[PDB]
């Protein structure tokens, strides 16, 4: 069956700001959105929850708190502010990252108190588990949902840009639209080449 | 026409489905396929991702691999296209468990010398690859698994498919596979498998 993509495809992306691979794959999705007409929805997940390291709860608790009080629309700017500081600038002092990122995103500074409360953990677990695969397991990171189809990956070590980003998106939509596709990996295997 | 080298294990149901897919791709895209045998057991008999039939006994499982090695060494990869089609039709589509018979009938169907069946018990064939660090005939490098395909200067494991896609859909999956494999900083894309291999 010649499968056809929906009118506007959808990327649903669960993130923990601490994961470098999710950072890269989320930036790829933002690059795709510049050259393809797609919906991008960010959602919070937790490396702490995946792997149950107590500092790991701070940023996702703050992110959940911000979304609950101001809507999912603040996740994209807060994620960018946090990831720029954790990954690009390598800041491991998560107290500073949280306070700076809230200010950068234009969010109330009192949201930082969420990092040390457990009051948002129920909501965080619900959001995390909503990124579930077809049989109800957590997906390692990075993960992405393409038109409702959950994938592990694409695992990217570098951010694809521009039309190259868009071509990878077209290929992802092709794989998501074929229900009997399950895996692809790059490999370093060659035949003998005589010319 | 781009040359695609395809490394298959004769007992692997995913190699089988993806090899039927790539022959459908060659009807809607400008590629030609050269098949080559590969077994993960050559370089590491202990890994847990060997095809299921290796569980039932190594001596038995080696048979089809060694015959395919011997055939390619003596006659070139071109004869593996009919040889593999004959073996896989019996092993996978028909569930034929008697591999000695599969080998004899498949060599016959491929027009190959019947004596090549004697490679089945000769460990020279796999040990020659092993000693030079080859996971398959005419392969160097990784053996992530079977199927592995090399085309247009890049190589990939998969696509892992539970059904043989047909027509232009097969070609679209080809385009997607080559696109991902051609990005040098792409590593893996995986969806939880919800279906077993399903042959035609
Ligand atoms: Cl997840």
Swiss-Prot record, chain A:
Pfam families (alphabetical): Rv2466c-like (PF22234)
Entry-linked Gene3D superfamilies: Glutaredoxin
Gene Ontology terms for molecular function: oxidoreductase activity
GO cellular component assignments: cytoplasm; peptidoglycan-based cell wall
Keywords: Cytoplasm, Oxidoreductase
Domain of life (superkingdom): Bacteria
InterPro entries linked to this entry: Rv2466c-like (IPR053977), Thioredoxin-like_sf (IPR036249)
Subcellular location: Cytoplasm
Keyword Iron: no
First-listed, main subcellular location of the protein, grouped into a coarse class: cytoplasm
Signal peptide start-end: none
Subunit structure: Homodimer.
Role this protein plays: In vitro, the reduced form of Rv2466c catalyzes the reduction and activation of TP053, which is a thienopyrimidine derivative drug that can kill both replicating and non-replicating M.tuberculosis.
Name of the protein in question: Thioredoxin-like reductase Rv2466c
Species this protein is from: Mycobacterium tuberculosis (strain ATCC 25618 / H37Rv)
